[PDB]
Amino acid sequence: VSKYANNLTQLDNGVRIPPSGWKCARCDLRENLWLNLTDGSVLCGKWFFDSSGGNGHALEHYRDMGYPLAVKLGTITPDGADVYSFQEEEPVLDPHLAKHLAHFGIDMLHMHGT
């Protein structure tokens, strides 16, 4: 569980999650994405060997905003999703996933949670 999730600061500043449901800033990846919990910056992170992209936008986001938390998009299930912390450096959980995703328009139950 993320310890930063307790003190999760969200920043609605032009946050507009795309009609694609997800896709990162830098590269053109449809998967392996990291949706920032704060301002809603969607980035990604390739799984070792990838031939589509996965550049270092995460560090840039730490340079720009400094918010080291993002949801691993694509792993979103009715139960929950995977989250990565750049601050804790670990794959972390969030006891407010549903709230955060719901505030993002991300409905886990939409496909098969109802």
| Binding residue numbers for Zn(2+) | 24, 27, 44, 57
Q: How far is the CB of 60 from Zn ion (least distance, A)?
A: 10
Q: How far is the CB of 35 from Zn ion (least distance, A)?
A: 12
Q: How far is the CB of 72 from Zn ion (least distance, A)?
A: 12
Tokens 């995460």 identify what position? 58
Which residues touch 103 (CB under 8 Å, ≥6 apart)?
A: 10
The answer to whether 29 touches 1, Cβ cutoff 8 Å, is no
Q: How far is the CB of 92 from Zn ion (least distance, A)?
A: 20
In eight-state DSSP terms, residue 6 is T
Tokens 């979103």 identify what position? 76
Tell me how many residues contact Zn ion (CB under 5 A).
5
Interface with Zn ion includes 24 (CB under 5 A)?
yes
Interface with Zn ion includes 44 (CB under 5 A)?
yes
Please give the Cα distance from 80 to 82 (Å, whole number).
7
Please give the Cα distance from 113 to 69 (Å, whole number).
25
At residue 61, φ and ψ (nearest 5 deg) are -70, -30
Interface with Zn ion includes 73 (CB under 5 A)?
no
Applying CB under 5 A, the span of 15-23, 42-50, 78-86, 89-97 interacting with Zn ion comes to: 42-50
Nearer CB in complex with Zn ion: 29/101: 29
* Interface with Zn ion (CB under 5 A): 24, 26-27, 29, 44
